[PDB]
Amino acid sequence: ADMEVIELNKATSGQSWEVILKPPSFDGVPPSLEEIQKKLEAAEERRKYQEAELLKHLAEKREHEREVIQKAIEENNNFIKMAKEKLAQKMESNKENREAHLAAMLERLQEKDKHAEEVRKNKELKEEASR
Amino acid sequence: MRECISIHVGQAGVQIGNACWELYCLEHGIQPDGQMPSGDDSFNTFFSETGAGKHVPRAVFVDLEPTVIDEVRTGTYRQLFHPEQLITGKEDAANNYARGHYTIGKEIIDLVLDRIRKLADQCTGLQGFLVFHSFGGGTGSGFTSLLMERLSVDYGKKSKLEFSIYPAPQVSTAVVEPYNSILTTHTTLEHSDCAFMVDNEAIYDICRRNLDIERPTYTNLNRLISQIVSSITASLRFDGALNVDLTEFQTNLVPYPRIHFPLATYAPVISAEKAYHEQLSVAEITNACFEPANQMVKCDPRHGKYMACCLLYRGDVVPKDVNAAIATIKTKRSIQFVDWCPTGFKVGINYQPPTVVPGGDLAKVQRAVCMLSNTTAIAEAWARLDHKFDLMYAKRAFVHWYVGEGMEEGEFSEAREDMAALEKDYEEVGVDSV
Amino acid sequence: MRECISIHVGQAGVQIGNACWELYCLEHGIQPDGQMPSGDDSFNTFFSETGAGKHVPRAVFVDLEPTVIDEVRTGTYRQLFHPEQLITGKEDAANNYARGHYTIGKEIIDLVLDRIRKLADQCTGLQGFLVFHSFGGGTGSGFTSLLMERLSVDYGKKSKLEFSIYPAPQVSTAVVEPYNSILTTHTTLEHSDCAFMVDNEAIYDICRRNLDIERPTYTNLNRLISQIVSSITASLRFDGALNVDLTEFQTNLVPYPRIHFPLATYAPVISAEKAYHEQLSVAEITNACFEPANQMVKCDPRHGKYMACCLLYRGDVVPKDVNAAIATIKTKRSIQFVDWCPTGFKVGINYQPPTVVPGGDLAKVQRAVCMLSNTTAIAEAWARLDHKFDLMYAKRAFVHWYVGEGMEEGEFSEAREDMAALEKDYEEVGVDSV
Amino acid sequence: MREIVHIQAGQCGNQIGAKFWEVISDEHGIDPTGSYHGDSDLQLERINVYYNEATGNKYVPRAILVDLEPGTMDSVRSGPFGQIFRPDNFVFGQSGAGNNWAKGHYTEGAELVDSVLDVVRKESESCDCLQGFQLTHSLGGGTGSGMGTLLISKIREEYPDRIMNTFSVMPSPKVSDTVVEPYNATLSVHQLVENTDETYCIDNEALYDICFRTLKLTTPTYGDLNHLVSATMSGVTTCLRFPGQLNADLRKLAVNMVPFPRLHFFMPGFAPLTSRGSQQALTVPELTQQMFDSKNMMAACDPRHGRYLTVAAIFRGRMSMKEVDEQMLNVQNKNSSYFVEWIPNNVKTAVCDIPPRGLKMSATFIGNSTAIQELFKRISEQFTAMFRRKAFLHWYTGEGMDEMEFTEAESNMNDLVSEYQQYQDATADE
Amino acid sequence: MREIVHIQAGQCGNQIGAKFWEVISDEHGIDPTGSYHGDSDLQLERINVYYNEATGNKYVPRAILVDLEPGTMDSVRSGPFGQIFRPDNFVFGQSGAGNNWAKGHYTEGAELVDSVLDVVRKESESCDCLQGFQLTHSLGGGTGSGMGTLLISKIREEYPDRIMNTFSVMPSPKVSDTVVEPYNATLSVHQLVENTDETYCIDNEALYDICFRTLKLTTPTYGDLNHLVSATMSGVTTCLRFPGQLNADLRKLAVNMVPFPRLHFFMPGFAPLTSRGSQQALTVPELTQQMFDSKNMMAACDPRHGRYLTVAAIFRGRMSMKEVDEQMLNVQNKNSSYFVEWIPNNVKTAVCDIPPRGLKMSATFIGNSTAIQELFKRISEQFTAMFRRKAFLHWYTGEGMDEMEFTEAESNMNDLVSEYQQYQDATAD
Numbered sequence A: 001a002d003m004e005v006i007e008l009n010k011a012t013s014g015q016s017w018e019v020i021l022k023p024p025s026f027d028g029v030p031p032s033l034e035e036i037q038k039k040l041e042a043a044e045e046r047r048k049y050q051e052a053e054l055l056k057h058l059a060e061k062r063e064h065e066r067e068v069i070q071k072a073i074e075e076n077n078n079f080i081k082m083a084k085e086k087l088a089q090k091m092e093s094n095k096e097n098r099e100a101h102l103a104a105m106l107e108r109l110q111e112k113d114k115h116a117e118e119v120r121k122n123k124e125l126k127e128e129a130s131r
Numbered sequence B, C: 001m002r003e004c005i006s007i008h009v010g011q012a013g014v015q016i017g018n019a020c021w022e023l024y025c026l027e028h029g030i031q032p033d034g035q036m037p038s039g040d041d042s043f044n045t046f047f048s049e050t051g052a053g054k055h056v057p058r059a060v061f062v063d064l065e066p067t068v069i070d071e072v073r074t075g076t077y078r079q080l081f082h083p084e085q086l087i088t089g090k091e092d093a094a095n096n097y098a099r100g101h102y103t104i105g106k107e108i109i110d111l112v113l114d115r116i117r118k119l120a121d122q123c124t125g126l127q128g129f130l131v132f133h134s135f136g137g138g139t140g141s142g143f144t145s146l147l148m149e150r151l152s153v154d155y156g157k158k159s160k161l162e163f164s165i166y167p168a169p170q171v172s173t174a175v176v177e178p179y180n181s182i183l184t185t186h187t188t189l190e191h192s193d194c195a196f197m198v199d200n201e202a203i204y205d206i207c208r209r210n211l212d213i214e215r216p217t218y219t220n221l222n223r224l225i226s227q228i229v230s231s232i233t234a235s236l237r238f239d240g241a242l243n244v245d246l247t248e249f250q251t252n253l254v255p256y257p258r259i260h261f262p263l264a265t266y267a268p269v270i271s272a273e274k275a276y277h278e279q280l281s282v283a284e285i286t287n288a289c290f291e292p293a294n295q296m297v298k299c300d301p302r303h304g305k306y307m308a309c310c311l312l313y314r315g316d317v318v319p320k321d322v323n324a325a326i327a328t329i330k331t332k333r334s335i336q337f338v339d340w341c342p343t344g345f346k347v348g349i350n351y352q353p354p355t356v357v358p359g360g361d362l363a364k365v366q367r368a369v370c371m372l373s374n375t376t377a378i379a380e381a382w383a384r385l386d387h388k389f390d391l392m393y394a395k396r397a398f399v400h401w402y403v404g405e406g407m408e409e410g411e412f413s414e415a416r417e418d419m420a421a422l423e424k425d426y427e428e429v430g431v432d433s434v
Numbered sequence D: 001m002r003e004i005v006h007i008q009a010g011q012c013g014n015q016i017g018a019k020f021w022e023v024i025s026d027e028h029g030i031d032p033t034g035s036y037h038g039d040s041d042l043q044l045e046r047i048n049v050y051y052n053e054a055t056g057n058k059y060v061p062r063a064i065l066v067d068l069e070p071g072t073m074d075s076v077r078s079g080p081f082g083q084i085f086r087p088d089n090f091v092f093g094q095s096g097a098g099n100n101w102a103k104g105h106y107t108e109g110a111e112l113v114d115s116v117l118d119v120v121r122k123e124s125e126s127c128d129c130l131q132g133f134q135l136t137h138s139l140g141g142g143t144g145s146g147m148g149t150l151l152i153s154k155i156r157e158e159y160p161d162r163i164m165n166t167f168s169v170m171p172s173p174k175v176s177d178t179v180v181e182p183y184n185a186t187l188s189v190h191q192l193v194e195n196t197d198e199t200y201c202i203d204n205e206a207l208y209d210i211c212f213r214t215l216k217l218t219t220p221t222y223g224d225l226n227h228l229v230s231a232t233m234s235g236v237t238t239c240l241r242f243p244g245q246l247n248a249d250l251r252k253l254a255v256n257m258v259p260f261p262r263l264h265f266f267m268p269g270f271a272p273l274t275s276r277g278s279q280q281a282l283t284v285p286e287l288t289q290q291m292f293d294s295k296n297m298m299a300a301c302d303p304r305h306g307r308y309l310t311v312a313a314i315f316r317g318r319m320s321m322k323e324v325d326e327q328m329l330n331v332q333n334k335n336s337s338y339f340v341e342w343i344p345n346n347v348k349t350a351v352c353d354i355p356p357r358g359l360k361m362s363a364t365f366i367g368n369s370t371a372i373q374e375l376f377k378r379i380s381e382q383f384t385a386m387f388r389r390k391a392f393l394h395w396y397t398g399e400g401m402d403e404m405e406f407t408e409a410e411s412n413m414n415d416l417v418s419e420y421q422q423y424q425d426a427t428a429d430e
Numbered sequence E: 001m002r003e004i005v006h007i008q009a010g011q012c013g014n015q016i017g018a019k020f021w022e023v024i025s026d027e028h029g030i031d032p033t034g035s036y037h038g039d040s041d042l043q044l045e046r047i048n049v050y051y052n053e054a055t056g057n058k059y060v061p062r063a064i065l066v067d068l069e070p071g072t073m074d075s076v077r078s079g080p081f082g083q084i085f086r087p088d089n090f091v092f093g094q095s096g097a098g099n100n101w102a103k104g105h106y107t108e109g110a111e112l113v114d115s116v117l118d119v120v121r122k123e124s125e126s127c128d129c130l131q132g133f134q135l136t137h138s139l140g141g142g143t144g145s146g147m148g149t150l151l152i153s154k155i156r157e158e159y160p161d162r163i164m165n166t167f168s169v170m171p172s173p174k175v176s177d178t179v180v181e182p183y184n185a186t187l188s189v190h191q192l193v194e195n196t197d198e199t200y201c202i203d204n205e206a207l208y209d210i211c212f213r214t215l216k217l218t219t220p221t222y223g224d225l226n227h228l229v230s231a232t233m234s235g236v237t238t239c240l241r242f243p244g245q246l247n248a249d250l251r252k253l254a255v256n257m258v259p260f261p262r263l264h265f266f267m268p269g270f271a272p273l274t275s276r277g278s279q280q281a282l283t284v285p286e287l288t289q290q291m292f293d294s295k296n297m298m299a300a301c302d303p304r305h306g307r308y309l310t311v312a313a314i315f316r317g318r319m320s321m322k323e324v325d326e327q328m329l330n331v332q333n334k335n336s337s338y339f340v341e342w343i344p345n346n347v348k349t350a351v352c353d354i355p356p357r358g359l360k361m362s363a364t365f366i367g368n369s370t371a372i373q374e375l376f377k378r379i380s381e382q383f384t385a386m387f388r389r390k391a392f393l394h395w396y397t398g399e400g401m402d403e404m405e406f407t408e409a410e411s412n413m414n415d416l417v418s419e420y421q422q423y424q425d426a427t428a429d
């Protein structure tokens, strides 16, 4: 019913104006480069730390991998060692036993030789008396 | 002379840039080779001139991957741009804001600032920058916010205007787009003077409903977006009277600095295949500005308050018909302005009619209008995004991807708190006293 | 690489070795002079090659008396072996374990090890040793256990597999064979990774029942044993559809170091004189593996638990038929596996058909299978031997012959206690878990 | 992010790997000599992802063939496309792993790993922008399982910035080669949880059940199982290999599918389920119905027993984009309880014009479902049944391993299942 | 283990020893000159066990002939095959032993033993692998018993690693050469129990009873007795002399037949029981029936009065090995109570194609039966009857012996009896 047209500007290829239907209901109208560089550098150092931690975790894996191979070698070596000593002990125990069995057999037959000498000695003491 | 340098970041920014510069060339009679056979020297605000009469866009295209810019380098408009103003990396931000802002972005920021400085050196009265980018992409979100921060350091006074692509599940979205959107919005907020959000769902629906395209392509979407971008930049490229300089965008549309997100609404959008169409009157196209189906962002201004309204007409339009159309609007609907602002419209008519891309989907019309209104209703777009952000962040879903790139969890809550403050700011404007 | 060195000890080991190497030569087309007119090359795991094209077995024949090896030295295959591979003493162990391990054995052990080392030097990837011997002979029992102990010192954990002849009264046994069997088993247990026992009574019964031989000779017995040995080594001497490595045999068969005595079962074993009767299907020969009539050791797996089952097929056999045959067996209740073993099966398939010695008793078949199953039922064989040992040892009958050679009575009770523990180990592996 | 370096390890890895190259070479128009004889410029547009261009415009798979036994790789060389592979990329040992994870990871495989890394390094250096690695292997054997996971950890150390993707074949007693499979599998998933970005769980239990129950094959062979695998592998990688709506990339896939780093085990699916022979015309509603069908899953898990954290559906063939979108929305509303509400828009759909060989239309499903905990629970039960009795353990301790390493692998897999259960019980209650 | 050195001592030893060489020479096709005239390569295959090969491919028995009286050794030299023996291997004295064990063991035998050992040593040194020694002698006389046991102890001392086997002829009053035979026999078995590995007990009581009762010879001569001995010796050594199904070896035989060191006295048996020069056809079942027949035993013991610790049966001639196996199984099941159950598979059977002279088929039994205690009890009773009265004891004390040595020998033989009874009463429980 009541309009207000305020001719703002007119130019070669355009024309502008403001049309107010009703007025308002108020009296009054109502980082730096160092800082940004700091943020970007702080993010880069956080990312760098995370990657370092991952590579350290993977370095620990490699260390365990060479400890597994070493353990396999050490167990095999201890199996060879125990078998070598147990076998040497078994062959030594057997040599001692066989030596002892034969030594005892020698001694019992040597006793018989001594007894035979005693029998021959006893014949002399009986003889030379009769006739 | 008032030069404007356009910066297109990421796939969305680059592809939208292609459509805008194709349309600008058609509007100014510039051939794809830069030659222009010949309101008058106003196009020089967007185009510099070479000693061989070539007109080269005052633009820089940036992407952290080369494939999208490579199509520009080998496309129809390959001669239009100097190779130095097309900048590419080797690998993209993988839809990760932190990757685009902190890790990959740091690799090419100095190079892009050097090329923007080279364009600024060609300016006798640089107004500022127009930055095109997606909210969802890792480059569009992360690299853009890094660039905006550095531009504020190197060009303290210059206006910076954004054309941002708001995400929609219907148009090739990633799950983390709400994170990237809130992170970029938080960091860019204090560095942007005015931002025009373009909701992909709104553009997708207009293409389906008004252009009869069953499954719109990026070419269909971008050609429509470019018609709206062209309507808003027409006053910088021709001898206009409303929005003659980019400082005037802030003056006319954004009375409160943080609340710098105007709603764009365009009409008419008619299918080129629709025959016998009787040309729409000034009253018909003006009335269409208040229909939500024609908005660039899905929201409801009917349940909001206006703080500014700018009507940008193009073509066969006379002031008497515009004033009659505005008079009838007052009487039909209750369009409510905030207490401190007058209920009114700043109307500008640019005599140059709407230009259509030959072989496109839009029909050629005698007259068109783009309304730019600063309404509190646009906070509905923030609310939708913030809710999706909250659902995921409550579980810390995907945040390890960002932390892996050096960003802290504190930045997520800081960005979300800023969005909460922004939604509260729109609420403070939506109810006033004393 | 993948070489295997065979060691044949005592009369039984040597005579079985003769039958095996005769069969291997026929399977690979190697003449008794070592010439092989000519591929697969898998035969190089068992045969080294001379610059003059002679293929010489990677084998050593050892006996404390010369008569048995002398027949090899003057026999059909005298040119096959280098004289240095055939080692003999002057006087045997006189059916006394103590003479084979100590008194007589000690005189030739170093020479044997030197000759084994010479064969190992020809290997680029030695898999291990296959040791053939009787349980009953003084050499087969005493010398073998001394050799196994020395091989563990010189080759550490390098795999050692045995083919042991289990004593039967029907087949030329000595009264003290149960003593020699328990003494060698105790001594060799920690040094053997897998041992295939061959019960002479089982072979004797198979020759009588399946081959219609009223009174089987060692030639009849050994030719059948060699068919089974060939089936288990064929996986190493040929490249078929599914190849079983020597390490793969044991990994799948031996759940615990001490429980390493798989039961071998072979099919089909049929008379060369029999009527036509067309070829047994994969399902028929596979089902025959679970019939006690075909076993190498007399025991009852139907009242035992399986721990592993390896099926080694040869000839006209395709995996689809094997899988169908195994599927039926898996649904049978008469075959109970231990609860701690999810799937006990492992299949090997070699396309080379079963070779028969011309003038032999076995009929030529298109397909055959040898199953190697680790069943708790094999402990019945230990129980029979241990009982015979107990009957004599309770009176100390014949133990003076062993003590005379330096052995101690403590070694008899230690060996018997280990056998008691072994029988108890087989009981525990079959008990159900939680 | 352009080139992918493919690695196939062990018997299973080389068998399914060869099938993969046969299938995608047919799709890309590459014949067994390496020559292009296709009639679509779409086949060559992104062929650089998997193939190197050689003299005479030949296409050579960027594939590295690994095994500790020479047998399998000789069979690959003699197979249909055996001649296409770069001869220098065949890296093989002579000892074999004897289906022993410890042998593949610590003993025999440790001797061969540097030789393989030399070939990987040579391929990587010829990449303009390497995306990452794709490994095919089984978890039940010794080389693919043990050496495959050793290769992964070595590769992660040298290429921490690249994506590690695997196609891991899970063991099943239904189709078994070794009694010791649950030990090998548990030790491998312990490695995969820590050192992979994405793992496709190809379950032999599921492949057998599909062949037996659905395809009504009374006695299925590895060839029948591998036909399902190759079809799945072709579908899962379609986005990477073809120019489509989606610009593809392995890192972008991981960012969109992996909300929590350890939860990167995908349940693949395929429709239609086909056998080898003279087949029959599927519809979009039918294709979408199979998304939730447990019968169509390549992992023996019922998706209706858990919730999807994220789901990717790829449709192939000439079809209506409007219809696919409407059917996908239908499935989501009528199966809302099987999707986590706290990850908005967690179901993504892609459509490729190029259908696979012999099918006019098909759909491949990639799901990050909490129901995958059923697969790990099955391996865990089988592991405990043996470990309770220390059955076959001497074969691992003999290689230098400790029982403690078994307890840790089992414990980490049990933690993995508790993590899946945690997100299965999580609601958007606030 | 190839060569065996044979030693024959005293009258009896040289008489049965000569008969042994006559019998086996004919079996091996060797004539009294030492030339081979046979027609089977099996006769020469293992001829090295008992014969040395000499110039002109001659075969010389590895036999050493010993006696303190020149008499018997002159009769051997003049006998059939007397010229086959190596002349240097005849070692003889001139005094004689006068059926006195003390004379043979301690007095005149002690003077001659070193001379015999020199010949044994020479034969042993020419052996590639000496198995051991085989001694033929009587226990009732003085040289064979006294000097024979002295020889064995001296040989054991020099060759502790070799087997000592004897064919010991036990005395009997039915045959008799002197009342002091029980003394000589007891003193000898005391030596044999300690120093021999295996002893075949050839009992003159059994030989006389076979000749008198079975062969119906009212007055048997030593020639008639010796025919039974030579047949038994040929059978018992068949496995050593011929290539057969089993290897052979004296040590392997001892390990399989001797479960306890002292119980090494075998009860030989033979079938058919044949007359000294007569011709007359028995079946395998008939041959196997005689295994348990007391009438066929060369030791005067009834096997059914004890239990077999171990038994070896050797069948000779062309026969069915299947029939031998079935008949042997039959005998074992129907006589199970005569075999110790605590020595499994203690009955072994061997079959040789070569039959002995004059027989188409034969069977030799070698038994380690606890019933042999009947033989030792008989000698012990005869010994005690004399020793209670110290009868003829001055024959021995006159040579230097003490009455304590008699008490010890008697005690040792009584212990031997108690030991056989211990295992006869032992059960498997």
Ligand SMILES: Nc1nc2c(ncn2[C@@H]2O[C@H](COP(=O)(O)OP(=O)(O)OP(=O)(O)O)[C@@H](O)[C@H]2O)c(=O)[nH]1
Pocket: B009, B010, B011, B012, B013, B015, B016, B063, B064, B092, B093, B094, B095, B096, B100, B134, B135, B136, B137, B138, B139, B140, B141, B165, B166, B167, B168, B171, B172, B173, B174, B177, B200, B218, B221, B222, B225
């Ligand atoms: N309207 C429109 N939206 C686009 C276009 N290209 C991408 N988008 C949208 O942008 C979002 C994804 O961001 P992109 O621009 O593709 O990503 P970017 O900036 O290249 O970043 P990267 O992740 O590093 O590739 C989604 O919502 C897309 O639908 C385009 O040309 N037009």
Ligand SMILES: Nc1nc2c(ncn2[C@@H]2O[C@H](COP(=O)(O)OP(=O)(O)OP(=O)(O)O)[C@@H](O)[C@H]2O)c(=O)[nH]1
Pocket: C009, C010, C011, C012, C013, C015, C016, C063, C064, C092, C093, C094, C095, C096, C100, C134, C135, C136, C137, C138, C139, C140, C141, C165, C166, C167, C168, C171, C172, C173, C174, C177, C200, C218, C221, C222, C225
């Ligand atoms: N299967 C089979 N068993 C045999 C063979 N030779 C002997 N035996 C058995 O082995 C056991 C006797 O062991 P032998 O091998 O003859 O003795 P040895 O190892 O030569 O030892 P010595 O006592 O020193 O001769 C008995 O059970 C025989 O039946 C043979 O060739 N085949």
Ligand SMILES: C=C1COc2cc3c(cc21)-c1c(cc(OC)c(OC)c1OC)CC[C@@H]3NC(C)=O
Pocket: B172, B173, B174, B175, D236, D239, D240, D246, D248, D249, D250, D252, D253, D254, D256, D257, D310, D311, D312, D313, D314, D345, D346, D347, D348, D349, D350, D366
């Ligand atoms: C399940 C989800 C949640 O959000 C997603 C977004 C995307 C994908 C998966 C998901 C996705 C990607 C790459 C692919 O192959 C290389 C692929 O095919 C298997 C994919 O599934 C369609 C990564 C990017 C992709 N973005 C778009 C716009 O489609």
Ligand SMILES: C=C1COc2cc3c(cc21)-c1c(cc(OC)c(OC)c1OC)CC[C@@H]3NC(C)=O
Pocket: C172, C173, C174, C175, E236, E239, E240, E246, E248, E249, E250, E252, E253, E254, E256, E257, E310, E311, E312, E313, E314, E345, E346, E347, E348, E349, E350, E366
């Ligand atoms: C009474 C038994 C219990 O076990 C035995 C084993 C064997 C013998 C006797 C017994 C035996 C032997 C040597 C022989 O002459 C040299 C001989 O003929 C008298 C023999 O009797 C047949 C020793 C080896 C022989 N071995 C075989 C397999 O027959």
Ligand SMILES: Nc1nc2c(ncn2[C@@H]2O[C@H](COP(=O)(O)OP(=O)(O)O)[C@@H](O)[C@H]2O)c(=O)[nH]1
Pocket: D009, D010, D011, D012, D013, D015, D016, D097, D098, D099, D100, D137, D138, D139, D140, D141, D142, D143, D144, D145, D169, D170, D171, D172, D175, D176, D177, D178, D181, D204, D207, D222, D223, D225, D226, D229
């Ligand atoms: N689907 C499939 N599984 C296989 C194939 N070959 C073997 N497997 C499985 O892989 C496991 C054994 O591992 P394998 O690759 O053969 O041994 P490796 O050579 O030591 O890696 C078992 O679970 C088998 O069932 C194949 O061709 N296809």
Ligand SMILES: Nc1nc2c(ncn2[C@@H]2O[C@H](COP(=O)(O)OP(=O)(O)O)[C@@H](O)[C@H]2O)c(=O)[nH]1
Pocket: E009, E010, E011, E012, E013, E015, E016, E097, E098, E099, E100, E137, E138, E139, E140, E141, E142, E143, E144, E145, E169, E170, E171, E172, E175, E176, E177, E181, E204, E207, E222, E223, E225, E226, E229
């Ligand atoms: N069977 C047999 N016994 C004999 C023979 N000659 C003597 N005897 C017995 O041997 C014992 C006497 O020993 P003898 O050898 O003659 O005395 P030596 O000369 O001192 O050894 C008595 O038991 C005789 O019956 C003989 O030729 N054959």
Ligand SMILES: [Mg+2]
Pocket: B010, B011, B065, B092, B137, B139
């Ligand atoms: Mg992009």
Ligand SMILES: [Mg+2]
Pocket: C010, C011, C092, C137
């Ligand atoms: Mg032997």
